[PDB]
Amino acid sequence: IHTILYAPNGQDVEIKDYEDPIRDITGVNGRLHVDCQYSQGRSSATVQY
Amino acid sequence: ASDEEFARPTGQGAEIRDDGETYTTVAWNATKLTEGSRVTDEMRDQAMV
Ligand SMILES: [Mg+2]
Ligand SMILES: [Mg+2]
């Protein structure tokens, strides 16, 4: 089971603070591109009630 | 340059408004002032001054 992470810059989560000097605000923004996929779904069993 | 003005009271996180320096000019001309005189070579010699 693969967690595929993508970033145009670097590899991990991209979290940045920035300042708006027109409004006197710090923004903190986070982004990430993610998907999750089995290579072999047969390799997992769910337990059901 | 334009005269000194005053800042304005502003809400927190609100856009700071533009009131930049504005300019004008004073034109100069420059008029030619002239003055002249002539002295005869005979009197350039003869005068006591
Ligand atoms: Mg003002
Ligand atoms: Mg003004």
CB contact under 8 A, B15 and A25: no
How far apart (Å, rounded) are the C-alpha atoms in residues A6 and A33?
5
Q: What residues of B form the annotated binding site for Mg(2+)?
A: 5-6, 15, 19, 35
Question: How far is A7 from chain B, CA to nearest CA, in Å?
Answer: 31
- Minimal CA–CA distance to B17: which of B27, B28, B5, B29? B5
Residue B29 DSSP symbol: -
Per the CB < 8 A criterion, the answer to whether B15 and A22 are in contact is: yes
Amino acid in the structure at residue A36: C
A26 touches chain B (CB under 8 A): no
Helix, strand, or coil here: A16?
A: strand
Element housing B45 (H / E): helix B41-46
User: Which residue reads 């769910």 in tokens?
Assistant: A46
Å resolution of this model?
Answer: 2.7
